Structure formats: C-alpha cells, structure tokens
Design a protein around this ligand. Structure first.
Ligand SMILES: Oc1cc2ccccc2cc1O
Length: 222
C-alpha cells in the first residue's frame, strides 16, 4: 500500500510531519503530564474519518485506553466543529480499557480481528491509538527494568506488525517528565516531543523547526 497521512488538525504540525501522521508507522508523542498528548489523540480519532481532500482516510479507529482518559463528549465536540456527524464519528471508534499491561498486550491481538473484519470495507481501520502505551508497564515493573524492556519490546513489535501489515497509523502516547525517560528508545517510527509554551500554546519538535498550535473546540489548530 502507499503511505497514507492523517492530518493532525494543525497546518503547522502537519508541515512538521510532512502532511500528517503516516500509516505503516508508529508515531510516538512524549512529554510531561498536561502537554496535550491525549488531546492530539482525540483530534486524530476524528480527523482520520474525513475524506482525503480534508486530510483524513475515511478510516475507522481503534483506541486502547490505559488511564481512563478517553472522553466521548470531547470526540463529539471536535467532530461537530470539524463538520462531521458526532454519532457517526463515535460509531467508528472501537474503544477498550486495558486493565494492566498483560491485558493491554492481549487487546492488540484482539484488535487484529476487527482490523481483518473491516479490511475490505469502506471504513477500514486506519488509526490505532494506545494512550498511554507505557503507564502500566512503568508501574508494574518498578525495580525490574530488564523485564519491562522485554515486554515493551514485544508489545511494540506487535504494533509494528499491525501498522505495516494492515496499512494503519499507530499513534502512541508516553508520559515523560522529571528524571524520567528511556522514551521508547528507537522503537517508534517517529518521535514527537510535545510541550507547553507561553499562553497555553503547545510546541512540537521531531526527536531524531518546531510546530506551534492551540487546543480548541476543533481539537487542535494553528
Ligand atoms: O470491540 C473491540 C474494541 C477494541 C478496542 C481496542 C482494541 C481491541 C478491541 C477489540 C474489540 O473487540
């Protein structure tokens, strides 16, 4: 398949990303608590459902939530201010809460079943969100870094296999603050550092210029 791109909702961020996040890729956004990573996830879950002329892929979404941060009412707001029907947008987001890191890993295997079901339809899965990818692994493997890295490595390998095999954009969030961070090392296809700036602006930089955007009723925008 060719490489598809999903607009983030921000012309600035899209330019930094060469058009948007890519299918057949894992995009990892990392930054401190409150930097806007989950807002970007919510926005992408709407943007992907637009037609290509508007920066989407007419795609369905699968969302794995580890922190109970998915908000359907926020999806509704973004959709209504992106000219989409909110009920239709929510109907094309498959949502699951991961209870722990082992359940999170099983959910990725379960996602493949729905990906296969929708593959030949007019609304194939084009976006798989894992928010937060690292939170359960971090809490469960305190004092056991070597074992944590083994499990994370397999999890990321599973996500890579889905991205490439089924032409999906995988978007993952990772909280990194004071003293923290191996990030995801070199595992993602693309690392995006997100931070707060003056006056509520958000600033994005590729790790390995900078885009600037705001969180609004449209999700994010310049
Ligand atoms: O209905 C489902 C929703 C999911 C969401 C995320 C990951 C896996 C899922 C599997 C489902 O059957």
């Amino acid at each position: 398949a060719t490489i598809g791109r999903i607009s983030t909702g921000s012309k600035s961020l899209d330019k930094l990303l060469g058009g948007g996040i890519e299918t057949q890729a894992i995009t990892e956004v990392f930054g401190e608590f409150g930097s806007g990573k989950t807002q970007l996830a919510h926005t992408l879950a709407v943007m992907v459902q637009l037609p290509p002329e508007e920066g989407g892929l007419n795609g369905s979404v699968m969302w794995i939530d580890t922190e109970n941060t998915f908000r359907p009412e926020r999806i509704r707001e973004i959709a209504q201010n992106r000219g989409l029907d909110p009920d239709e947008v929510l109907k094309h987001i498959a949502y699951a809460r991961a209870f722990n890191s082992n359940h999170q890993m099983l959910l990725v295997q379960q996602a493949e079943d729905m990906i296969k079901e929708l593959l030949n339809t007019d609304r194939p899965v084009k976006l798989l969100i894992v928010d937060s990818l690292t939170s359960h692994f971090r809490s469960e493997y305190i004092g056991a870094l070597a074992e944590r890295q083994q499990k994370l490595a397999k999890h990321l390998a599973d996500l890579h296999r889905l991205a490439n095999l089924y032409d999906i954009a995988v978007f993952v969030t990772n909280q990194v603050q004071a003293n923290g961070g191996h990030i995801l090392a070199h595992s993602a296809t693309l690392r995006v550092y997100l931070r707060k700036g003056k006056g509520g602006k958000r600033i994005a930089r590729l790790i390995d210029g900078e885009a600037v955007f705001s969180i609004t009723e449209k999700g994010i925008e310049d």
